[PDB]
Every structure is written in structure tokens, then in C-alpha cells.
From TrEMBL, chain A:
<protein>
    <recommendedName>
        <fullName>alpha-D-xyloside xylohydrolase</fullName>
        <ecNumber>3.2.1.177</ecNumber>
    </recommendedName>
</protein>
<dbReference type="GO" id="GO:0061634">
    <property type="term" value="F:alpha-D-xyloside xylohydrolase"/>
</dbReference>
<dbReference type="Pfam" id="PF21365">
    <property type="entry name" value="Glyco_hydro_31_3rd"/>
</dbReference>
<dbReference type="InterPro" id="IPR000322">
    <property type="entry name" value="Glyco_hydro_31_TIM"/>
</dbReference>
<feature type="domain" description="Glycosyl hydrolase family 31 C-terminal">
    <location>
        <begin position="570"/>
        <end position="654"/>
    </location>
</feature>
<dbReference type="InterPro" id="IPR011013">
    <property type="entry name" value="Gal_mutarotase_sf_dom"/>
</dbReference>
<dbReference type="InterPro" id="IPR048395">
    <property type="entry name" value="Glyco_hydro_31_C"/>
</dbReference>
<dbReference type="InterPro" id="IPR050985">
    <property type="entry name" value="Alpha-glycosidase_related"/>
</dbReference>
<keyword id="KW-0326">Glycosidase</keyword>
<dbReference type="InterPro" id="IPR025887">
    <property type="entry name" value="Glyco_hydro_31_N_dom"/>
</dbReference>
<dbReference type="InterPro" id="IPR013780">
    <property type="entry name" value="Glyco_hydro_b"/>
</dbReference>
<dbReference type="GO" id="GO:0005975">
    <property type="term" value="P:carbohydrate metabolic process"/>
</dbReference>
<keyword id="KW-0378">Hydrolase</keyword>
<comment type="similarity">
    <text>Belongs to the glycosyl hydrolase 31 family.</text>
</comment>
<dbReference type="Pfam" id="PF01055">
    <property type="entry name" value="Glyco_hydro_31_2nd"/>
</dbReference>
<dbReference type="GO" id="GO:0030246">
    <property type="term" value="F:carbohydrate binding"/>
</dbReference>
<dbReference type="Pfam" id="PF13802">
    <property type="entry name" value="Gal_mutarotas_2"/>
</dbReference>
């Protein structure tokens, strides 16, 4: 049975909302105004530039919690026009228009021009008599050359056109259709996005079932989805992150190098300090150390109890680690094994997820007799938070929130939540609990996580991690695709396991993966059955790790400004080429390269021989430290050794490097090394050096006109320099001194105003 | 339950084939050499550069007809059985099994791996729920490796990330399913199973192409390149070469539309309207309602609408047109012939003896059982009778919804007949045409196809809609069907469903007349140009004249399609396989070796297109553009991006009214960006597709030497964008807007400058 | 799923027989003349004063022996009238008329006056997807004061109006709906009878399902029934 809206029967304005009653048949005559279904479509606007559509059949159905944490406004200024030919609701430049009369049609328009919509008989209500279940479905059009992105952390081809996607968290890995972080939101290169507002399973056919349409369907009697205007993908992500939650600003130290104890290796304080001292003796900067599962006794994860026979003095170990200037992370998850002595206590208190019959839900995956913490029970939440606070008190700084995706549905939650929606919303509840604990103990500014699962709104709790990848170039590319997709799904910060997780990597794979990981927002050395310390592979591996850790620390003024941008506008640090250059037709299908912020284009090397092909958009691009220049709007082929890769800065750029290559959290406005790239005649470029809190502490402007570059500074800075790159010699400089360098002329300023001739 | 090969137990050489017995467990010790399955992998080579792999579990299963028409050969192979590995080599392609503890399957080109099956990535599955058994394989995909083909699919051109099912315009389904795919790494794969093959292309396992089939064995062929074109060449040699359609078929076709009212008067009205408006027309097609409604396909003309069929056809032929009529392999119950067919047993029966019937497309529809030889002869007799009245070719529609709960006359396996029926049906019609009009004059307009059906051109896109989205879908489908072994492809100009806006119709005319085969056909609205606008007539005239003028080049490209299986409408990846910018290009294509066409998909005329390496020149605007980059342009209804690559010697003709004329008389040669020290060749084809005249142009400093070989007369050469020259020896010169025109007085000229 | 004749598409005269091709939807326009079932109603006369109606869906079904021993003649003098408004087949005083145009209607007439018939959407083809079975059913009207008799040796009330009857021999007795002698032929006090020509189980709802109609249904792809004129019940039996 298929029931579809075919004609508008009535349109009513209820305040700032517009209700359309539509019938599946002609109902212009009274004889046809009975014995027929009637769809009720509510059009509203929870935020300027966002239009929500609620298509309902039966309102008597149950609509139980949880619901996505959306910042829904009920007083947004809209304009509603109910004419004889159509009815239109306008929020800012976006509008929704229902065509009255014989031909039903729903259109989403930008300033009057159609950007998408549902054609006649492309949405409605379906009754599967086989399974005896009811669904509501919609089909939004795809224009010529229109590409779709996002839909969570998916590792399939970056462009979604032609794919079936299902918003159902599952533990597959990095090489499968399954995903740990499913978000029913997609984005388009035409500058609009769509959010299907259903925590339960949403089924997307992206150009697969109907090749010219994105179809999405859900179970039940109503379908709610929001169309979010741009007009650019960046603006779309901005509106979406304002609507569902802004990414938090991670602490500066979190952007350093992380080292883990690996998974199934033997570790104690002696081994941890042995590796840390090996890092120090090899002059390898380390900033965060992570204790993985076996910091608790096996089969007892996660009971929060230190193994006495392996860590007899945990607090003293942590203080000595912190005395070394390091930060501490530990592994946790929302499950507990039956072996733990705490399991009986939790069972008696009723803090574990129960089946409808009262028995506990358990399975033998990951842990014997595994049970789930019921976070719908407030007392279980307080117990978990008490354990978390106790660990933070002994010196732990952050947490790795692993797992939280295979949530069963044949259960009854303490608060009565709908299991079908809890399956996904549990990741949010769990990560939010841990994040609130961190806010209460270390402080909101110092709060950071390492999370493997996520739901709509979980971007507010960075950072997020790719998962169980393999040690080869193909899986490296898969990880990059997943990171780009999650960036375009509302998450600003993303990490991945350098060198892979399963199996030991060949030396060259490890070196290339190090280069790629240290040019990401967050970089961690972690493995499953093999160490990830550099010297376990080669001496050149140590050199590569040192080189790129030093590089990342020198770039921190720029990277932390980009992180501030991610917090303020929802712009991911790891941007897909389409995201930065949405008007360039050559960037639609680019997944082997990315933009690290506004100004840096990175193209990791996926070849043992060092071969790499990459596309440069329009302009004159300059390598960050090799300094070679290349023309833009074309592809380039190169070969690089283990210490190099394509890292090119766009023209008309004023980039801020730092003078510290040992730690990421330092006074970036002291000794700042400014770098000027291809400042054209009549153009001006700006550089904002961030403070610790993410705000701008110093702003430097450079305007070129003919042969005069005027540089003006505003704010607080000291001892900064500016490198006219690929300019060997100048005709003088007033306001500072000049010197030569391999990279160009270095001017040392003595004030916030200099004027360069030539 | 899952059973997978994990270790090599034995390798035996049986003649020119290599059999590997592999175990799903450790079997180096006798105690473990029992109570275990044993996979048998036969590696062989039916053709140089092609390696077939047959992985089987139980040989006691039934393996009944039909099978794909493969040209299986004494091919030179080299077998090497060492202590570390076993390798079978055909030409540059080789398959290597790693012995010892680590099982591994690798395909190598000159020793370098191009793909393969890793440990625990293939094997045998027993679903006890459905009680069915399947065999599956997973071939690796490298970084940046893209997949194309698998038939005429209207999804994204690159298959990476798609579910495909080999089971016959705006949906995942397909009219022409081919279990063969191609890669930008210069190899292809053919899964040798006519029944349903399930492909997960980067969908289930994102870094692998997985293919599975039901039964106890899986047979697939890896075909080397090293270029995609070479892959298509070997594949078309293996499964069938595209036939060379007659020249007249490359003209403009016009249909009566589907459910519109037409009679002899309407046919004459369309013909006379085309003629008075100076619109050349070359083929006329009669659609379904040339037979009485509800009686398709009984081959009986409708008397109240076509009272005099043979005489009308005779007059149409006197005006120089060719005639096509609609047919399909079904018959309606209303027909008086239905009783004859049932009593004679020519219709497909259910196992119980009753006829198979349903009420879709026709009331009480029945299927002609083409496994019955006498039914085939009856069908062919009707087709020949239609040819006797003057019909020249046939439109073989339908042939896809073949039931499986049936019993065929010859005992064929229904699951495989579901797809092979298209081949059988098209082959009968093709044999009829060869026996009546002649092999050279054989042409079809077919909507269904199976492996090997490329031998029966032409093939038609199907039921598209009248908007730019469906136009782009059609282009994608044509590119895919080209990369799946078919050299010639058409589509309904203006769309099929709903009436097109004028601009959509004009852009679609531009696109269709720059295709191998161009037809104006619709469902509920006429497709004559003046049914939209008068400027629509202008567009149709302009581009029909253009195509007739380009036929000297287009028919040479069609001969190339027949000889090497290279489609006339090439995807950018096929022509520029080494260019990273062409991997995902579906809105533009190469019409042959030298011409790049970018249809316009915008009402405003805006179009963005990518140009590969070189200096490109528009075919009639003559403006030049640098290559290796994207370009933005705006064109009116009479124009679109049509650019010729550098170092090109293109042959246009002197006739713009018909496509089938003596192209070697009055030939207009066009020289495009001939660099210093470069040489270019141009082969003008004869009517039979062979080269009748060859013209070479060599540039040396400022002297261009041009030499001709064969039979030609009165031909000229246009130095494009060269306003004046310093001299010409052997012929005369004249000026033109497009460049210097040299009229030759022999087959040897020497141009100074 | 129920498919019923609603409009006449075509009427063809095959000798002394009249074939009506009727569609379950509007087919006045070419765009809708495909992707539809088509009922084939053959009207014939095997004997003066008797009109046979064969309502069919699929001809490909098996129609195996046995069949009733009917004295069917092929050369009975009939008159066929194919107009723009209706089609009529006349044997003696009896005639059958299908109304062409927009709305289908079937009438049986004695010298031009209606004695019974099938109104719009009162016959057709039924597909039970649960049992996977196909049926053909018909409903002939009952006039005011019209009573039904016969249907074999049944021990229920003499007048059948309001009774369910099934033509299936059973060893029940004299106190049950079952019958030793089942005959799918019924008679009316208006001087006509009806014989459903199916040796297998025939299901009669005599004024039970549709109180103003005699409904008879059979399994399969065709339903054949004969209307027998009188003008008296004795003449009907003769």
C-alpha cells in the first residue's frame, strides 16, 4: 500500500507556522471529502535560514524520548503568503513553496530560485503488509552535477551519489559500510544541507534507488526534516552547528603528540617510563600519554579499579608523569564485565540495562557476561561520574570514550526511553556525561575527550577517533575519507591511529602515516598487537616523527586559530577540497588530499616509491618549507622521500608560524614567525594570532600596492618577524631590520607598523 | 556458515591449465587431512592477456545451458610450480598463488601486482535459513582505483560504493545488465555467470570489489590492458565484436511517438513538414500502434489506420527514406494469432503445462518461446514478410521481464535464460535481417542485451524523462554501456516522458545529433521540431547538417568500434586514462578519437567542461583554448562546446543532406594544431568500413608535406587559424574565415609556412 | 485484489457468437490502452431460448475433462446487433445486451423486457493472495417478489432466497445443508433458469451475500453459465 499527497486541500497559518492539509486524491467536490487519508504538513523555521517540514499521517502514535538536542526557536521572523496559486513560507533567503491546484509540488527556493524539492508522488506513506509496519518517505531532487557529502563517518567513496546509507551505529571498522558515528545529515555542493530529525534508523538511498533523488525513509507516522541553506557549504555547516551544537575548543596541549601503551601489550610503570625516556633520549617530543584497556584487570572492564599487581601506586605514577610535563588519558567504556566484583553491586542496585522481563541484558562479545550501564537511571549516572571524578582527582586529565554503538533494542530503559532511538542517542548521553564531569573537574576550557561513537549534537565533545584501521595505504585513504566526511557532518576535530591498528606496518607505510597524522588536528601513536614507537621500525622513522612533531608545534598559531574557527563557525580543521572551493568543478571528487585550515593544502603520499598526484586550485602555491612554487588550477605529479609530502600554502596569505618546536601550548604571540605568500598588487591579507582562550590577541594586516607593502599590527605581540618568501632582496624597509634567509627576506619589526619597498 | 581457502595443499599441471587444491585449514600433517572441504581452483587462459579462474566446491552439481557465447581457445601459457608459489602466465598477465602458511591470490602485469584476493576474502557460504549456497570473491581496489561499466546503469558513472545486480532511466534497475567491469588501472573482470551476479563495488568492503553467485562454483576472467581501450579490445574479441552499422543508420530518425494519434496522413504530414522546412530526414519508424491495441505483437497492420501498408511503405522508400517498425517478443491474448500459437505450442509454458501469463503491458500477455525452433521460424517468417513490404530494420523492444518459474522447450535453466533471452531474441532478428537485406545492411534499435549482444547494434537508452537531469542520466548510461562492450548507442532526443520545454528540447537535439545514432521519439507528445518552436527547427537543421558533414570521420570511428571494440561515444577516462582529472567525468565525452563534446545542461546556456593536454579548437567557432584545465562558457541554442584536439587531420564531407554518400569525393580536410616535428594521419573510410584513402601531414619547421594514398578526388585541406601562408606547391590556395583552404591537384603537396 | 469489468472496449461478431472485450478501467483514450487486464465475454446460443455466457480472464489455463454432457449446437439461428450504444445477441425470445459507452451493464431480456442481469461492478475476478487462489464470480439480479428454486435435492426451505449452497456431493443426510445430488442449476418464478457450467464446486449465495442478487462463483480463470428462457418454469425445465 502506497499513499502519497497529490493535491492541496487547505492551507492555514498558525502564527509563524504554515500547515498544509493534502489529500491522496481529488477532493475539490464534497462527494470526495471523506473515506480518504489526509497528510498534515507543518512548515516552520527554528532558526534563520532553516526550514523544518513535519509530514504526519496519524497523530495518535506514540512519540517518546529521546529526541535530538536541537536549539529550536519558536519566534523566528518568517513571512507567510497564502495565495490562490501557491503558499510560501520564507525564513531569510530560504523559502518553501507548496503549489496549490491540481499538480502538487513542494519546492525549496533560495531568493526565489529553486534549489531542491519534492515532485508529485515522490513522498508519502507506505504500509508493508509483509512485516506489518508503516513508513514515511521523502525524495529530494538532485540537480545536474550535484554531489552529496556527509551522512556521518562513512569510509565508502567520499561522494555519496549512488549509495545506500543507514543511520544505525555498528562496530564494523574502517573497511566496511558500517559506521561508529552515524548522523542523518547530508550536505551538497549547491550550498544546502538536509537533516532528517529521527534518532532511530533512517534509510538513505542517495542516487541509488532513484538516481536523480536523495530518498530518505523512517518508520512511523511522521517524518521531520530540516532544509538548511548556505549559500555555501561552509555556511551550511555554520547554521547546522548552531542548530545542533558548536564544536568545543580543545586545549592547546591536546594538539600535541599522543602515545598509547598499545592494546594487548604488557605495560606497567616501568615500561611506560622506559618508552617515555626512550622518546626523550631520541629528542622526540611527547605531550600526552594514554593508558589503554589493561590498566584495569582483564575481563573486568570497565570497573574503574586499578590492577594492584600491575599498578600498585597509580597516583604516584601519574604525578611523576605530570612532573615530566605530560598529560594523562585513560580508556573507559559504558560496559562492564561480569567478572568484576562491582558487577554484583550494580546488578543489585539496578544500574544495568534490563530486559522487559526484569533480567539483565548480557552477551559474550568483548567481555564475558558484558552488561551496559543504564544512563537513563540518574543514580547510575552519578555513580559513573563519581568514579570519573575520583580518577581525575588522582591526576587524570582526559578520557578515551570507546565503544557505545551496539546498543540493544530488546530492552527496557529506566526512564522508559524508546530503544529504537536510544540505539544512537546513547553515544550522546554517555559522551555528554563524561564531558560534564570534565567541565566540573578540570574546567570547560581544559575539557577534551577521545571518542569513538557520536550522534547528532555530539560534536560539542571533541575529539573523535577513526577506530580500528589497518596498516596499509588503502586503509590510510579510507581513514582520510572518513575524516573528511565527519568534518562535513558537523565535527571540527578528528584523529586516527598513526601506523594503523591491526598488524605491524611496513616502515614506509608508517612514515607516510606519521606525516599524515601530524598534519591532522590530533595525532596519536596507538596500535593493537605491535608497538607504535618510532624506533620499533627505523631510525628514519624517528627522524620523520621528530620532523613532523616539530613542524606541527611550529604551526600551532595557525592551527589553533583554525580550531577557534571550528568552534565559532563549525568549520572543520580537516576540510574537503569541495568545502573550501565549492565553485571549482575540479574539486567535487577529491578525497586523497585536503585543506588543513584556510590556507594549507596537504596531499599525503600513498606510494612506497613516493609518487603522488594532487590538484591545485587557482593561484600560485608555495611549499611550506621546500619553498618551490607551482601554478594552480591543475594537477601536478611529484615524488617525495620519507621526510616530505605536498604541503602547499595558497597565495595572498599571511601565515603565522611559531618559534617553539617542542610543545604546542606556548605564547604564540611572542617571537611569531610571520610568512607572506604571494601578496598580489592591490590585495590585502590578514593574520589573527590566537590567545590561549581562542580569541584574537594580535592581528597583522599586509597591503600590497605596486612595490609598497604596508604592514600594520594591532594587539599584543613582541619580537615577531615577517618572511617575504621567494623575495631574495628588497629595496629597503622602514620600521624594522632586514636579513637574508633560504626562504626569503626576514624583517625583524620594532613596532606594529612597517613599510617595505619592493 | 562460511568456508574459505586458507592454505595451498597441492598444485597440479593439467596440460596448459593449473589446478590448485586448497584447504580451509592447516593440512601439512596427515592427522588433519580429513573431515574437511577442499576448494578446487582451475586457472586457464582462453586468450592472450585473459586468465580464467574457476573456483569450485562440489562438482556433482548440475551445470546446464545456456552459457555465455565465449570464444574459448591452444593459447600459449607458461606454468611455473616452485616451492614458494605457483604461477600461470598468458602474455603479460599472470596469476600467482602463494604456497605455505599464507594463502594469497595475485594478478600481475609483467611481474607487478594489479589486483588479487587476500587471505579470507573468497569462498563458499551456506545459508541454512534460505537453504541456499553461494560462492564469492573479493578483488582488491588500490588507492585512487575507480570502477566503470557493468552494463547500462544510470547511477553515478564511477561504480565505487554501489550495489549492482545482474538481473534485467531513473532507477537502479537496468535494461542491459553485463557482469563485466573495467578499471582505471588498465584491467577488467568478467564474471562468467548468466544468472544473477551480485556485485558490491566498494560498498560492503570499501577497498574491494566483491562478486558472488549462487551455486557451487564461481568462474571469472581477468582481462589485461595495459590500457582500458586494450581491455575493451580483448573483451570484445572474447565475447563478440560490435557490428558495423550501415551508413544510412547514422542519419536522423523520426518516430510517430507512442500513444499519439497517427495514420498514413500523419506520416505524410511529418515527412512533408520536414521536407518543406529543409530538414533532412533519413529513417522513419512506426511505433506500437501500427498494430491494433491489445494485440502486440501479432505483426498485423491496423486496417482502419494503415489500410494500405505495402503501398505507403513503397512511396516512403521512393522518397529515399528507410523504414523501421516496432516489435517485441510478447503477444497479447486478444490477438487471433494467440490461439494458433497456443495450439502449436510456441508460447512459454509453466511446469504444469499451462501458459505463463500476466496483465502487464498487454492483457493476458504471453512470451514467444525462442527455445522452440519452429516458433523461431514462425517469428522469422513474420519478420521476413514485413521486410517484403519494404521494411529495412526493426526496433527490438522489451525482452527483460523473463519469468523463472517456467519450463523452456529445450530445458534451459530459467535463472540463466532470464538474461540470455535478450541475446537469443536479438540474434534471431539479426539472422532474419542478414538473410533478407544483407549483413552489411543489418541494424536494430534494441532496448535489452546480454553478454555478446554488442554484435547486434544499435542499442537504445530507454524511457527517459524530458529534463536536464534525465539527459545527464542518459549520457551516464551511454558511457557505461560503451565501457561494457557496446560500440553504438542511442537515446530519445527531447526525452520520452512528458513534453520538454523548448530549451531542453534544443539542447537535447544538440546532444543527440552529436551521438552515434540520433532518433526523435516521445511517449505522449510529438517530437517534430516545430512542435516546440521554430528555433527548434533551426537547431535540428543545423546539427543534422553538421552530423552529415562529419560522417567521413564518424564512420571511420564506427569502423574502429567494429575492429577494436572502442565505442564512438567514449568516456574521458577511456581516451585519457593517465589524466587524474578525467576519472569522474560524466557530463562530457569524446565523440571519437579527436572531438570533445560537452552538452549544455542549463536553460541559460552556461556550461563548464574540462580540457586535457593540448591546444583545443572549436569545430566551427574556431576559437582556441589551452588544455589541462576547466573552462566556463555560455552558448546559444545553436552552439555547444565541440573542440578538436591538436595535431589532428579531420575529414569532413561536402554533403549535409544525407549521411551515406561518397565521402572521398570533395573531402574537406581540416588541420588542427600540427606541431613542429609531429605527424598526423587521417583514414577516410569506404562504404564497407575499410580505408579508401589515407592522408598524412608532416610538419618540419615551416614546411608541411602532405601525402595521399588510395582513391580520392577534388579534396581540399584547411590550415585552421593560419590566415595566410608563404606558398603552396602542387595545388592552389584561397582564403576563408576558418583559415587557408588548399585545393590539391594530386596526392602530394608542399606548404611553405 | 478484485478486478471487474467496468467499460466495453470492443465488440466483435464471430459467426453466430458475440465477443465483448471489456476493461477494468477507462480505455477511451490510447494512453490507457495497455498495462491492463481485459475480460473476454463470449455470448453464444447452444439451443433456441438459451444464451451462454463465458466470462474469461486467462485462456492459458488448463481446462481438463470431465465436462457436463451438454447438447451444444453450433448452428442455432441467432441475431447479433452491434450498435454504438450497446451490443445484443438474440436467441428466440431471449436476448443478452451489454451497454457500451462509459458504464458497463449486462441485461437479459425477454422480448425486450429485462428479466435479470448483472449491474456494474457485480461480476469479475478475485485473487486471494493468502490462499494463492483465483476465482470468477457473477451476480444476476433478483426482482421484487422473485423467488429461487432448485439447486439439487436440498432439504432446507423450499424457496432458496437467503441460502448458501455449494455444489459438492456429501454424505450428510436429510437434516443438513449437505446434499447427495448437487446440481448448479436454479429456477425462478419469473420464467427463467440459470445453469453454472462447472462440474467442480460452485458457490451460490442466493440472496444471502447480496440480498437482491443471486451470486455464483467458481475457482479458476473462466466462468460459464447459461440463461434459460421460459416464459414459464415448466418451459424452462423443458
Amino acid at each position: 500500500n502506497l499513499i502519497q499527497p497529490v493535491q492541496v486541500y487547505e492551507v492555514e497559518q498558525q502564527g509563524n507556522e504554515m500547515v498544509v492539509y493534502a489529500a491522496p486524491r481529488d477532493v475539490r467536490e464534497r462527494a470526495w471529502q471523506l473515506d480518504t487519508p489526509l497528510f498534515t504538513l507543518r512548515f516552520f523555521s527554528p532558526q534563520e535560514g532553516i526550514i523544518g517540514v513535519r509530514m504526519e499521517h496519524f497523530q495518535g502514535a506514540l512519540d517518546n524520548s529521546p529526541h535530538y538536542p536541537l536549539n529550536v526557536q519558536k519566534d523566528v521572523h518568517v513571512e507567510i503568503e497564502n495565495t490562490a496559486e501557491f503558499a510560501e513560507l520564507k525564513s531569510g533567503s530560504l523559502s518553501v513553496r507548496v503549489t496549490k491546484g491540481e499538480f502538487w509540488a513542494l519546492d525549496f527556493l533560495r531568493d526565489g530560485v529553486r534549489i531542491t524539492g519534492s515532485q508529485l508522488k515522490n513522498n508519502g506513506y507506505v504500509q508493508d503488509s509483509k512485516t506489518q509496519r508503516n513508513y514515511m518517505f521523502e525524495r529530494l531532487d538532485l540537480g545536474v552535477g550535484e554531489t552529496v557529502y556527509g551522512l556521518g563517518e562513512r569510509f565508502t567513496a567520499l561522494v555519496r551519489n549512488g549509495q545506500t546509507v543507514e543511520t544505525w551505529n555498528e562496530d564494523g571498522g574502517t573497511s566496511t559500510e558500517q559506521s561508529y558515528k552515524n548522523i542523518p545529515f547530508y550536505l551538497t555542493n549547491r550550498g544546502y544541507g538536509v537533516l532528517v530529525n529521527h534518532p532511530q534508523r533512517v534509510s538513505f538511498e542517495v542516487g541509488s534507488e532513484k538516481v536523480s533523488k536523495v530518498q530518505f525513509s523512517v518508520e512511523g507516522e511522521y517524518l521531520e526534516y530540516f532544509v538548511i541553506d548556505g549559500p555555501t557549504p561552509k555556511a551550511v555547516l555554520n547554521r547546522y552547528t548552531q542548530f545542533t551544537g558548536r564544536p568545543a575548543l580543545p586545549p592547546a596541549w591536546s594538539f600535541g603528540l599522543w602515545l598509547t601503551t598499545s592494546f594487548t601489550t604488557n605495560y606497567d610503570e616501568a615500561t611506560v617510563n622506559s618508552f617515555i625516556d626512550g622518546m626523550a633520549e631520541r629528542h622526540l617530543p611527547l605531550h600526552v600519554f594514554h593508558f589503554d584497556c589493561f590498566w584495569m584487570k582483564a575481563f573486568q572492564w570497565c570497573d574503574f579499579e586499578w590492577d594492584p599487581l600491575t599498578f600498585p601506586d597509580p597516583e604516584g605514577m601519574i604525578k611523576r608523569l605530570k612532573a615530566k610535563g605530560l598529560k594523562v588519558c585513560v580508556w573507559i567504556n559504558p560496559y562492564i564485565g561480569q567478572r568484576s566484583p562491582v558487577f554484583k553491586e550494580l546488578k543489585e542496585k539496578g544500574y544495568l540495562l534490563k530486559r522487559p522481563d526484569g533480567s539483565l541484558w548480557q552477551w559474550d562479545k568483548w567481555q564475558p557476561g558484558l552488561a551496559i550501564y543504564d544512563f537513563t537511571n540518574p543514580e547510575a549516572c552519578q555513580w559513573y561520574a563519581s568514579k570519573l571524578k575520583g580518577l581525575v582527582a588522582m591526576g587524570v586529565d582526559c578520557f578515551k570514550t570507546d565503544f557505545g554503538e551496539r546498543i540493544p533494542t530488546d530492552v527496557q530503559w529506566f526512564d522508559g526511553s524508546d530503544p529504537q532511538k536510544m540505539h544512537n542517542h546513547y553515544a550522546f548521553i554517555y559522551n555528554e556525561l563524561v564531558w560534564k564531569v570534565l567541565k566540573e573537574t578540570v574546567g570547560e576550557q581544559e575539557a577534551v575527550l577521545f571518542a569513538r561513537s557520536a550522534s547528532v549534537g555530539a560534536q560539542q565533545f571533541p575529539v573523535h577517533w577513526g577506530g580500528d584501521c589497518y596498516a596499509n595505504y588503502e586503509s590510510m585513504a579510507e581513514s582520510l575519507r572518513g575524516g573528511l566526511s565527519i568534518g562535513m557532518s558537523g565535527f571540527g576535530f578528528w584523529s586516527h591511529d598513526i601506523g594503523g591498528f591491526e598488524n605491524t606496518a611496513p616502515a614506509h607505510v608508517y612514515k607516510r602515516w606519521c606525516a599524515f597524522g601530524l598534519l591532522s588536528s590530533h595525532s596519536r601513536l596507538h596500535g593493537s598487537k605491535s608497538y607504535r614507537v618510532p624506533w620499533a621500525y627505523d631510525e628514519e622513522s624517528c627522524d620523520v616523527v621528530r620532523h613532523f612533531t616539530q613542524l606541527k608545534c611550529r604551526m600551532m598559531p595557525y592551527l589553533y586559530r583554525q580550531a577557534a574557527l571550528a568552534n565559532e563557525f563549525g568549520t572543520p580543521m580537516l576540510r574537503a577540497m569541495m568545502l573550501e572551493f565549492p565553485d571549482d568543478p575540479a574539486c567535487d571528487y577529491l578525497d586523497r588530499q585536503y585543506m588543513l585550515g584556510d590556507s594549507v593544502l596537504v596531499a599525503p603520499v600513498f606510494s612506497e616509491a613516493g609518487e603522488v598526484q594532487f590538484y591545485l586550485p587557482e593561484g600560485r602555491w608555495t611549499h611550506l618549507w621546500h619553498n618551490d612554487e607551482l601554478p594552480g588550477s591543475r594537477w601536478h605529479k611529484q615524488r617525495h622521500d620519507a621526510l616530505s609530502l605536498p604541503v602547499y600554502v595558497r597565495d595572498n596569505t599571511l601565515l603565522a608560524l611559531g618559534n617553539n618546536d617542542q610543545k604546542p601550548d606556548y605564547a604564540w604571540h611572542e617571537g611569531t614567525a610571520f610568512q607572506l605568500f604571494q601578496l598580489g598588487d592591490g590585495n590585502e591579507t590578514v593574520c589573527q594570532v590566537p590567545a590561549a582562550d581562542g580569541s584574537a590577541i594580535f592581528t597583522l594586516k599586509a597591503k600590497r600596492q605596486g612595490n609598497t607593502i604596508t604592514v600594520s599590527g594591532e594587539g599584543e605581540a613582541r619580537g615577531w618577524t615577517l618572511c617575504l618568501r621567494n623575495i631574495p632582496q628588497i629595496a629597503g624597509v622602514e620600521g624594522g631590520t632586514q636579513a637574508g634567509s633560504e626562504l626569503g627576506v626576514v624583517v625583524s619589526a620594532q613596532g606594529n607598523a612597517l613599510t617595505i619597498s619592493l
